[PDB]
Amino acid sequence: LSGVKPVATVYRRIPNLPDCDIDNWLNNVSVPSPLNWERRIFSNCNF
Amino acid sequence: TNFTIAGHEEFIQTSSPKVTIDCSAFVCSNYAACHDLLSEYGTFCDNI
Numbered sequence: 001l002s003g004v005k006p007v008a009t010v011y012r013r014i015p016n017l018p019d020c021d022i023d024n025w026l027n028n029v030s031v032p033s034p035l036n037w038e039r040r041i042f043s044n045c046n047f
Numbered sequence: 048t049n050f051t052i053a054g055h056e057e058f059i060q061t062s063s064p065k066v067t068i069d070c071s072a073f074v075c076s077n078y079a080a081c082h083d084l085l086s087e088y089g090t091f092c093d094n095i
């Protein structure tokens with residue numbers, strides 16, 4: 001006689017790029033004034 | 048003038064382990080595209 005594929009999948013992979021860490025810069029103890037509005041460019045990272 | 052009786056032994060093969068193979072688990076494990084492409088060959092797995 002005859003001799004199903006469950007949808008449950010486990011996907012694990014080590015990242016190749018570090019984290020962006022945007023929360024650390026937004027929650028900084030130094031808040032710039034609206035005249036300053038400091039800028040930080042984020043690139044080549046995972047978020 | 049004087050004799051004795053000696054014994055020997057031998058082995059002759061008679062049987063062999065029975066093997067059963069199917070195409071539903073060797074070529075295409077559980078996929079549908081493989082089964083669709085395997086059926087294109089016709090009755091190639093019905094002779095094995």
Ligand SMILES: *[C@@H]1O[C@H](CO)[C@@H](O[C@@H]2O[C@H](CO)[C@@H](O)[C@H](O)[C@H]2NC(C)=O)[C@H](O)[C@H]1NC(C)=O
Pocket residue numbers: 049050
């Ligand atoms: C044939 O050979 C057998 C075995 O060598 C002889 O049997 C032996 O005989 C001697 C002498 O009587 C005994 O001391 C041994 O104990 C015997 N051994 C066994 C295993 O039986 C036998 O005597 C020989 N026959 C003749 C006619 O010479």
